[PDB]
Amino acid sequence: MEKAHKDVSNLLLQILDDGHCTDSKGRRVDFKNTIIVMTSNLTKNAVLATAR
Amino acid sequence: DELKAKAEDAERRYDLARAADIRYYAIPDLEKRLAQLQAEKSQADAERADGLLAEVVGPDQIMEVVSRWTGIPVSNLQRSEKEKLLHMEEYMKQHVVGQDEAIKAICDAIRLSRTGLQNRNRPLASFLFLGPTGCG
Amino acid sequence: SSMQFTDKATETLNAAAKYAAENSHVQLHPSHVAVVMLDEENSLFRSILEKAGGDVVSIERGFKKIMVRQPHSPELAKLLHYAHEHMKKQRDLYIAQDHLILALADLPSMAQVLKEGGVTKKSLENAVTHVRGAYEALSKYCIDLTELAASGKLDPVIGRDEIISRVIRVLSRRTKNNPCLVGEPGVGKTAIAEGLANRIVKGDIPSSLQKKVYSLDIGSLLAGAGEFEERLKAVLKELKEAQAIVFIDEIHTVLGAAIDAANLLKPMLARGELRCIGATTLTEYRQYVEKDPAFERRFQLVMVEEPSVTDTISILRGLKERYETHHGVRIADAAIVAAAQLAARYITQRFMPDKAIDLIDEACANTRVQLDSQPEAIDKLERRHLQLEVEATALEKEKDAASKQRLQEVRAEMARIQEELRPLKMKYESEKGRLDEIRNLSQRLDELKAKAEDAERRYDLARAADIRYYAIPDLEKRLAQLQAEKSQADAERADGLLAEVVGPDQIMEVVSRWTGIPVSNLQRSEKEKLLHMEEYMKQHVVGQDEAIKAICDAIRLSRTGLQNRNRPLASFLFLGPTGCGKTLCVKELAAFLFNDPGAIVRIDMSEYMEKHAVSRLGQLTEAVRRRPYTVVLFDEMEKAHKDVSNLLLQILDDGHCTDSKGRRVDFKNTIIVMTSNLTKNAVLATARRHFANEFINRIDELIVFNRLTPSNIRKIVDVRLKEVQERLDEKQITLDVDDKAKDLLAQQGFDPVYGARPLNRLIQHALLTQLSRLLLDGGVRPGEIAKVTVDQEGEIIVIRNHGI
Amino acid sequence: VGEPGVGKTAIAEGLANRIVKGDIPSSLQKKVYSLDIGSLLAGAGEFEERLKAVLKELKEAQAIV
Amino acid sequence: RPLNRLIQHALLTQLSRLLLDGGVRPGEIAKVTVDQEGEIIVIRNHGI
Ligand SMILES: Nc1ncnc2c1ncn2[C@@H]1O[C@H](COP(=O)(O)OP(=O)(O)O)[C@@H](O)[C@H]1O
Ligand SMILES: Nc1ncnc2c1ncn2[C@@H]1O[C@H](COP(=O)(O)OP(=O)(O)O)[C@@H](O)[C@H]1O
Ligand SMILES: Nc1ncnc2c1ncn2[C@@H]1O[C@H](COP(=O)(O)OP(=O)(O)O)[C@@H](O)[C@H]1O
Ligand SMILES: Nc1ncnc2c1ncn2[C@@H]1O[C@H](COP(=O)(O)OP(=O)(O)O)[C@@H](O)[C@H]1O
Structure with missing residues (x-):
């Protein structure tokens, strides 16, 4: 989750706030039971400061 | 179940005297007899040390079908x-x-x-x- | 049975009697019908006879000699009887101009002239086969608006006095005599032409205008096939000889295009032999009218502005009586003003007055179900009494020592419910036939007012004299008596007072359901x-x-x-x-003034920094149009270029932005907030240098934030821990924190070099972490007051009282 | 509005149970009818004559479909 | 430039507060004078 622009970054922000995304067909899938995990690569104090 | 389906037609066919006989006499009499047979049957399970089981549909029966279709055993689903x-x-x-x-x-x-x-x-x-x- | 004749076939016998009246005649002979048909433009009686041969001149001269020998004719009665008997014989096709040829061939008086002229009886069979395969076309393919307006079947138009008067001036001009109601799908376009037809019968129109109004149906002309040219040319021919103004709804769909249909309307509108009233959308108006220079020469731009909040109230007063008849309810005067104010401050689906009528229609319909299907206040007591009545009867038939003690407890609670259910059940049975009678007595009076106005406008003062003077004055006393006795009986029940009268609280229920805002936030002025x-x-x-x-x-x-x-x-x-x-202050603004925390849009400058994304500030213009009360947040304003600030200059100076589609978005009630991370005197002067000298002067307040003081840190932990206790009130868990634990977390999380972000993370990774640990093993049980104090080594720990 | 599988046929079937019972307002009684498209195409303009007769019977009787 | 912001953050600020609670009724005459402290204040003409 680092090889993309800013289109998919702003779409995933509303999931962590409202809890559901706006579907193109017209649905509101509630993400209250779906965990969100990511994988990237950006002692341990200087590593997390790069991804910020 | 027969009196339950017939009671639904009483409220639709405009029957006040007919609905008063089913919703106030047929239902209570058919429920007390069914609950009495369930209590007398459970008392014979302990008097024989091996009574008739495999009749209470619960977590041991619903999880058995899912365990066969998927693969995860039942012991991994009955945990608190x-x-x-x-x-x-x-x-x-x-x-x-x-x-x-x-x-x-x-x-x-x-x-x-x-x-x-x-x-x-x-x-x-x-x-x-x-x-x-x-x-x- | 009953026969059905078209308007063209009906006027055929009337036009034949007009020509015979000048020649001194007392009866109408069927031979006069063939004379009128031979004097029309592009008639069908001549082309059909040409295929079979014969001599039309010998037949035309033979029919003219029959009417001279004349002294309802007895021969005409046989023609009307044959049209009713043979109306269920052949196959398809109703009645028109070509079907009347076979009706005249069955008459013995008309068949002798045909046989002696040329075309015999056998030639008429093969002649009508090849040709096979308001007036005539103005009745099935068009709907006359003046007919429904004079018959009392049209909704009143109140609030369009500044638009209808302008269309009259356009029609009176020599050139550009084709109005076009240019507006938006929501501000009203079809109802504007409805008020123009009302002034035609009354006589308020000038003498220069005496035409009619015909609604051209687009879907009716496309019924079937190829064969579209025979249906479009028939409508234009009937409107030329009758001189009438046709109304075209959505002209962008029929004029400008699959099947070519706009080519038949260009020569008619250019020679002044046709007057059309357009009503399309401004979005499609610039692609079908302004694109062709020939169309602008005949069409005039007529803008339709959405009414304000003052005119919207007067619009609902006209349609108030229409809903008081169908819904059978009483609309209060306070619900009309509140409807026009709540239709543009919370929900937004269309425009005025379209987005305001749905609130009255939905509120009046909710009371129909809440009264005839037993109200909630009455059904609640019946459901509780039904569960206790079925249980008491089961214990009376069972003789047991434990059944007599339980029956006494059920009877004690059954007598309390039955004491209050009988006055409510007996009253509901009497109000069932009384409330339904009000709707029955109102729908009949609405139809009588329509038939009474139709007779007074069509010169018939013999039928309307018994409706407005007898059928109505004798029925208003019974309708007003049932409404007065129903309102007095509702106060005796001490419940359901707002279940029959649509008031201010009834309108707020519909708005609260279509969004999610609580009712308590609607009453706040x-x-x-x-x-x-x-x-x-x-x-x-x-x-x-x-x-x-x-x-x-x-x-x-x-x-x-x-x-x-x-x-x-x-x-x-x-x-x-x-x-x-900077971010928390924006979220708290919409939660009080706007009452909608979710209505805050965030447009970051990470993707709109390029020059190609400046025109989409458009995506931001279209987004704020759907939701008026929105919060536009500008994050990372220090990274924006000069093209962004130059586009927002016209918004703060003119009050609106220039839309790409020619629309106009109101930017008067929209908040403008920004976010930037640029003692306090030198900081404010830095931001004024990067931007222009004019953009910084237009900004009203220039708030400059500062770092957090150590004295305000103690207040932060006092209000942050309160939200944790509020989320645990559902489990009956009281969260209490002493003064010792409130000082330890305030001296460790103090980091003014970054902000208040590491502040709450220290509490979650210590206080909130160990608090959830005891909620699983058996430490903190739902129903015990928790205590959090400081231990002996300095660490936030939760005091437990139960083991694992 | 819904995908073919969420339950749309039972909505019209459950509404007919409340019509005969009396849960609907007596001032405006409706009747539920099922317009099957398979029986209308059993002949052959046959479809234009069979469908027009069904819509006429619903306007003079005040009922849904 | 500071003159346009001084008349709004002193004379127009206290004037808008009286128009929301009941300080200046529509139909009276507003009087703005200088008090003994030294600040442009808006004197109301209605009881609290
Ligand atoms: N404790 C372990 N024992 C054996 N194999 C491991 C262990 N931890 C990780 N691996 C292996 O290392 C690999 C790491 O793959 P990873 O880089 O996560 O793939 P991706 O980049 O597609 O997510 C895995 O395929 C896994 O098999
Ligand atoms: N003066 C008025 N009084 C009552 N209703 C009006 C008035 N003006 C417009 N309307 C309503 O606005 C609606 C406009 O409908 P129409 O023009 O067909 O499409 P659109 O809703 O897209 O404008 C009409 O249904 C009418 O009831
Ligand atoms: N006055 C305040 N008192 C206590 N906490 C605050 C205050 N203002 C902001 N916060 C905290 O800051 C967080 C939001 O920070 P944010 O405004 O996004 O930082 P930035 O302005 O750097 O973007 C919130 O979680 C909130 O708890
Ligand atoms: N009494 C009921 N209770 C719950 N679900 C029902 C009931 N009656 C029907 N359904 C559901 O409605 C669905 C109807 O399916 P079907 O008629 O095949 O297509 P559609 O879902 O489009 O109506 C069924 O899948 C069934 O699960």
Whole structure:
């Protein structure tokens, strides 16, 4: 989750706030039971400061 | 079940005297007899030390069909919810050995959003795996 | 049975009697029908006879000699009887001009002239086969608006006096005599032409205009096949010889295109032999009218502006009686004003008055179900009595020692419910036939008012004299008596007072359902919100005492009337370091003034920094049109170029932005907030140098944030821990924190070099972490007051009382 | 509005149970009818004559479909 | 430039507060004088 622009970054922000995304067909899938995990690569104090 | 289906037609066919005989006499009499036979049958299960079982449809019967279609045994589904989150940090350390400070932080965000300490508008947990790869 | 004749076939016998009246005649002979058909433009009686041969001149001269020998004719009665008997014989095709040929061939008096002229009887069979395969076409393919307007079957038009009067001036001109109601799908376009037809019968139109109004149906002309040319040319021919104005709904779909249909309307509108009234959308108006220079020469731009909140109230007063008849309810006067004010401040689906009528239709329909299907206040007592009555009867038939004791407890609770259910059940049975009678007595009076007005307008003072003077005055006493006895009986039940009269509380229920805003937030007026605004912001945002007062000083000056209507609500420019209260202050603004935290759009400058994305500020223009009361947040304003600030200059100066589709979005009631991370005197002068000298002067308040003081840290932990206890009130768990634990977390999380972000993370990784640990093993049980104090080694720990 | 599988046929079937019972307002009684498209195409303009007769019977009787 | 902001942050600020609670009724004459402290204040003409 680092090889993309800013289109998919702003779409995933509303999931962590409202809890559901706006579907193109017209649905509101509630993400209250779906965990969100990511994988990237950006002692341990200087590593997390790069991804910020 | 026959009197239950016939009682629905009484409220539609405009029958006040007919509905007063089913919704006030047929239902109570048919429910007391069914509940009486269930209590007398359960008393004979302990007087023989091997009574007729395999009749109470519950967690032991619903989980058996799912276990055959998927593959996960029934013993992995009959566990309590309040007991799985306590031993969750100890089960992940069996195969993954080396990240003693990372596995403990995983259960900190899951056990907090399931006890009312987190807003319901947010998902379960939000993680961000960083650092070099190959750790797990 | 009954026969059905078209308007063209009906006027055929009338036109034949007019020609015979000048030649001194007392009866109408069927031979006069063939004479009228031979004097029309592109008639069908001549082309059909040409295929079979014969001599039409010998037949035409033979029919003219029969009418001279004449002294309802007895021979005409046989023609009307044959049209009714042979109306169920052949196959398809109704009645028209070609079907009347076979009716004249069956008459013995007309068959002798045909046989002696040329075309015999056998030639008429093969002649009508090859040709096979308001007037005539104005009845099935068109709908006359003046007919439904004079018959009392049209909704009143109130509030369009400034638009209808302008269309009359356009039709009276020599050139550009084709009005086009250019507007939007929601401001009203078809109802505008409805009021013009009302002034035609009354006589309010000038003498220069005497035409009619015909609604051209687009879907009716496309019924079937190829064969579209025979249906379109028939409508234009009937409108030329009759001189009438046709109305075309959505002209962008029929004029400008699959099957070519706009080519038949260009020569008619150019020679002045046709007058059309357009009503399309401005979006498609610039692609079908302004594109062709020949269309602009005949069409005139007529703008349709959406009415304000003052005219919308008068619009609902006209359609108030229409809903009081169908719904059978009483609409109060206070619900009309509140409907026009709540239709543009919370929900927005169309425009005025379209977005205001649905609130009255939905509110009046909710009372229909809540009264005939037993109200909730009455059904609640019946459901509780049904569960106790079925249980008491089961214990009476069972003789047991434990059944007699349980029956006494059920009977004690059954007598209390039955004491209050009988006065409500017996009253509901009497009000069932009385409330349904009001709707039955109102729908009949509505139809009598329509038939009474139709007779007075069609010169018939013999039928309407028994309706307005007898059928109506004798029925208003019974309808008013049932409405007075019903309102008095509702007060005796002490419940369901707002279940039959649509009032202010009834309109707020529909708005609260179509969004999610609680009812308690709807009753709060706009005047009381500006008074208790400073006390609400201090409860969530502390430390910035000089910034909260500056926000209210820029909003109160725009609502009273001390500033011109050329700027939005309040333009802000937040500065200071990060983590000082730039994002939380924006979220708290919409939760009090807008009553919608989710209505805050976020347009980041990470993707709109390029010059190609400047025109999409458009995506931002279209987004704010759907939701008027929105919060536009400008994050990372320091990274924006000069093209962004130049586009927002016309918004704060003219009050609106130039839309790409020619629309106009109102930017008067829209807040303008920004976010930037640029002692306090040199910080403010830095932001004024990067931007232009004019953009910084237009901004009202220039709030400059500062770092958090150590004295305000103690207040942060007092209001942050309160939200944790509020989320645990559902489990009956009281969270109490002593003064010792409130001072340890305040001296460790103090980090002014970054903001208040590491502040709450230290509490969650210590206080909130160990609190959820005891909620799974058996430490803290739902129903015990928890205690959090400081231990002996200095660590936030939760005091437990139960083991594992 | 819904995907073919969420339950749309039972909505019209459950509404007919409340019509005969009396849960609907007596001032405006409706009747539920099922317009099957398979029986209308059993002949052959046959479809234009069979469908027009069904819609006429619903306007003079005040009922849904 | 500071003159346009001084008349709004002193004379127009206290004037808008009286128009929201009941200080200046529509139909009276507003009087703005200088008090003994030294600040442009808006004197109301209505009881609290
Ligand atoms: N404790 C372990 N024992 C054995 N294999 C492991 C262990 N931890 C990680 N691995 C292996 O290392 C690999 C890491 O793959 P990874 O880089 O995560 O793939 P991706 O980049 O597609 O997510 C896995 O395929 C896994 O098999
Ligand atoms: N003066 C008025 N009084 C009552 N209703 C009006 C008035 N003006 C417009 N309307 C309503 O606005 C609606 C406009 O409908 P129409 O022009 O067909 O499409 P659109 O809703 O897209 O404009 C009409 O249904 C009418 O009831
Ligand atoms: N006045 C305040 N008192 C206590 N906490 C605050 C205050 N203002 C902001 N916060 C905290 O700051 C967080 C939001 O920070 P944010 O405004 O996004 O920082 P930035 O302005 O750097 O973007 C919130 O979680 C809130 O708890
Ligand atoms: N009494 C009922 N209770 C619950 N679900 C029902 C009931 N009656 C019908 N359904 C559901 O409605 C669905 C109807 O399916 P079907 O008629 O095939 O297509 P559609 O879902 O489009 O109507 C069924 O899948 C069934 O599960």
